């Protein structure tokens, strides 16, 4: 196994997957690393196993169908994985914790959103449909763009949004279009 965390690229107290070489901090993996479980498979492996059990799940899907799906375990997991892939980008630190809003010329958002609020939401089973998760995720980057306006700092929202959207398309097998 790795000598660093797969998410945050640092060494530390790591928990190693029993089916791939990946390693994780406790609260870096999503869900948080389960107490016992020997063997333990990480979320990368568990996502792989879905595909290897239903190879037609990689056939193209419409976004609109994906968003109405209930958050049964297999979709709960994909959201968890998608969230994790956003945390893997270092620029995610700008979106992790509760923001504040006090800039000349701008007003704060009506509904603030951040990645740890979304992680806690997934964790306490608050989302019933994929739709709900994807909306809060998109909200984070929408709120960022509206607040930083023309400051080049809005570029960070676009960059991390792109990481989210590419990974959404891959994980949920969206039909590839132009």
> Residue 70's beta-bridge partner residues?
129
Q: Which is nearer to Zn ion, 48 or 129 (CB)?
A: 48
Q: Rounded to an integer, what distance in angstroms lies between the CA atom of residue 48 and that of residue 105? A: 48
The distance of closest approach from Cβ of residue 55 to Zn ion in the complex, given in angstroms and rounded to an integer, is 8
Q: Output the smallest distance, CB 88 to Zn ion, in A.
A: 10
> Quick one: which of 12, 69, 81 has its CA closest to 45?
81
Among the residue ranges 2-10, 82-90, 98-106, 143-151, the one whose residues contact Zn ion (CB under 5 A): 2-10
Check binding of 1 to Zn ion (CB under 5 A): no
Q: Which of 7, 84, 86, 118 binds Zn ion (CB under 5 A)?
A: 7
Tokens describing residue 29? 């993996």
Which of 8, 16, 50, 174 contacts Zn ion by CB under 5 A? 8
CB of 144 to Zn ion, least distance (A): 23
Contact 1, 17 (CB under 8 A): yes
User: How many other C-beta atoms lie within 10 A of the C-beta of residue 12?
Assistant: 12
CA angle, 161 then 167 then 170, to 5°: 145
Binding-residue pattern over the window 12 to 51 for Zn ion, x denoting contact by CB under 5 A: -----x-xx-x--x--x-------------x-xx------
3-state helix, strand, coil in the chain (%, to 5): 50, 5, 45
Total chain residues near Zn ion (CB under 5 A): 12
Instruction: Report the site for Zn ion in 68-97 (rule: CB under 5 A).
Output: none
The least CB distance from residue 138 to Zn ion, in Å, is 25
Distance of CA 95 to the CA centre of its chain: 12
Residues in the site for Zn ion, rule: CB under 5 A? Answer: 5, 7-8, 17, 19-20, 22, 25, 28, 42, 44-45
């Amino acid at each position: 196994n790795s000598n660093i965390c797969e998410v945050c690229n640092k060494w530390g107290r790591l928990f190693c997957c029993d089916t791939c070489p990946r390693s994780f901090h406790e609260h870096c993996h999503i869900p948080s690393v389960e107490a016992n479980k020997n063997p333990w498979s990480c979320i990368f492996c568990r996502i792989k196993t879905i595909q290897e059990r239903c190879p037609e799940s990689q056939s193209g899907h419409q976004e609109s169908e994906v968003l109405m799906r209930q958050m049964l375990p297999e979709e709960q997991l994909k959201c968890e994985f998608l969230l994790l892939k956003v945390y893997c980008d270092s620029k995610s630190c700008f979106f992790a914790s509760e923001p504040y809003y006090n800039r000349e010329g701008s007003q704060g958002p009506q509904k603030p959103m951040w990645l740890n609020k979304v992680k806690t939401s997934l964790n306490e089973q608050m989302y019933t449909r994929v739709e709900g998760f994807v909306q809060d995720m998109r909200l984070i980057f929408h709120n960022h763009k509206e607040f930083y306006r023309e400051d080049k700092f809005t570029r960070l929202g676009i960059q991390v949004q792109d990481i989210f959207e590419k990974n959404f398309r891959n994980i949920f097998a969206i039909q590839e279009t132009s």
